[PDB]
């Protein structure tokens, strides 16, 4: 059931694109009559050995995960020729949380944002128990399964920690979403479950601003960077963070949630709460808001 025949996968449209891959909406149509189930299918482009190797990793991680808060693996496909590997996932037609928040802001209250926050945290706790660092976590890669249920997706940068080490180091990335990453990741290329906690803090900021473009992390950076304009953003960001500057509390954000953000953004990775510690707090806040 987990091998999809490539000649039965029918392309419909593009769901996502990165440097080295794309996720495409397809129909799996073994009967050839356009009645089959729809699926989301990842494949690589511009890929070298490192990219192919990372994709094999991504498939093994996603296949092993079984959480209500992680996008479901369905299977794999291989065509003829080479570079033929495809990853088949469930398709969630409500799309990403970033877009959903922007579209429906006026009817999504703080209780609903608290629900999403709790669900994302549960998915991250699941990941943590499997020693998996997600790295990419952001509203643009969390999917909406229904209006009261979200799931973590985009495992393109996910990695398992070795059994005896609590972090990994990479060679410097070419293109990082700098406003989501922990300072030790930006400066020293160190990633861990604690860098993921930093990014989750930025996710909370995204949720409680409804991903409004006027107060996006980049927009806030550009306001806070000061009157000197032509300074490289990464260099300046790292200075601001080292000075202790942080994203502001969204006006509508509950004070307790802002305090959690600040804890997620502790300078030392060891001072940040674990997802296991954040979950009960968000759960308490969500259940208090019903
Ligand atoms: C241009 N733009 C507005 C965006 O790209 C964006 C934002 N912000 C996010 C976005 C748009 C569409 C999707 C999307 N739908 C999906 C539906 N079922 C799916 N199953 C597995 C991945 C998946 C889906 N993805 C993404 C595909 C790439 C990885 C992240 C999820 O996410
Ligand atoms: N985590 C956090 O506060 N990051 C940040 C700070 C200033 C501007 C943009 C992003």
Author numbering: 814 to 1103
Quote what the paper states about this structure.
High resolution crystal structures of 4 and 5 in complex with JAK3 were determined. Both compounds showed the expected orientation of the hinge binding motif featuring the typical bidentate hydrogen bonding pattern. While the complex of JAK3 with 4 only revealed the non-covalent binding mode, the structure in complex with 5 displayed the coexistence of the non-covalently and the covalently bound inhibitor 5. Furthermore, we observed a yet unprecedented binding pocket formed by R911, D912, and R953. This unique feature is induced by interactions of the nitrile moieties of 4 and 5 with R911, thereby generating a distinct cavity in the protein surface. Structural comparison with other JAK3 structures reveals that the side chain of R911 is dramatically reoriented and forms a hydrogen bond with the inhibitors nitrile and nitrogen. The guanidine moiety of R953 is flipped approximately 180° toward the nitrile group of 4 and thereby forms the ceiling of this arginine pocket. Alignment of the other 16 available JAK3 crystal structures revealed that the orientation of the aforementioned arginine residues is conserved in those structures, confirming the induction of the arginine pocket to be a unique feature of our inhibitor class. While 4 rapidly diffuses from JAK1, JAK2, and TYK2 with residence times below 1.4 min (lower detection limit), a prolonged residence time of 50 min on JAK3 was observed. BRET experiments using the JAK3 mutant R953A, as well as the double mutant R911A/R953A, showed similar affinity of 4, suggesting that the induction of the arginine cavity did not significantly affect inhibitor potency.
Janus kinases (JAKs) are a family of cytoplasmatic tyrosine kinases that are attractive targets for the development of anti-inflammatory drugs given their roles in cytokine signaling. While the other isoforms of the Janus kinase family (JAK1, JAK2, and TYK2) have a broad spectrum of functions in different tissues, JAK3 plays a specific role in the development of immune-competent cells (Ghoreschi et al., 2009). In our quest for a highly selective JAK3 probe, we aimed to exploit a non-catalytic cysteine (C909), which is not present in the other JAK family members. C909 is situated in the solvent-exposed front part of the ATP binding site, where the other isoforms possess a serine residue (Chrencik et al., 2010).
